[PDB]
Design a protein around this ligand. Sequence first.
Ligand SMILES: COc1cc([C@](O)(CCN(C)C)[C@@H](c2cc3cc(Br)ccc3nc2OC)c2cccc(OC)c2F)cc(OC)n1
Lengths: 51, 81
Amino acid sequence: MVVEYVEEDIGPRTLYSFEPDATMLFESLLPRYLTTRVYAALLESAASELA
Amino acid sequence: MDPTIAAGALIGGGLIMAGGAIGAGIGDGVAGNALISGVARQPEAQGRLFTPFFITVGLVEAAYFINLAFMALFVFATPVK
Ligand SMILES: COc1cc([C@](O)(CCN(C)C)[C@@H](c2cc3cc(Br)ccc3nc2OC)c2cccc(OC)c2F)cc(OC)n1
């Protein structure tokens, strides 16, 4: 995945608490993101095939 | 003679103001350390975090003031005499 730093959006924003930590959550969430992307791809392909 | 009581009030009284300052000085620290972090995590909390803070400090400062009073009672009244 390409890392693109879009904006700041939030400066004096209430900081998020991470449990246990941000890095482990991120590396455990990335494959779920990839597989939900593949799921959305399969759904779009099914709808396109029916059309 | 009587001087041995006098210093007994100056030393003891000093102790009453030693353990006093170690009490408040650190207390107000360990309490305030939980305020800053709180405010550092969400600035809009400074409004409500003063409700617990100024309670703890209150208690803490009592432990100081009493000793303060007693120190006077030791240096300006010398009870055992
Ligand atoms: C001049 O000596 C004090 C003392 C005290 C206290 O000891 C608390 C001291 N801390 C706040 C530093 C207090 C007390 C005793 C307790 C005893 C048990 Br067993 C369980 C909970 C107890 N909780 C307490 O209050 C939290 C207390 C005592 C006596 C009369 C009292 O009525 C005036 C009274 F309030 C307060 C005080 O204020 C100037 N002066």
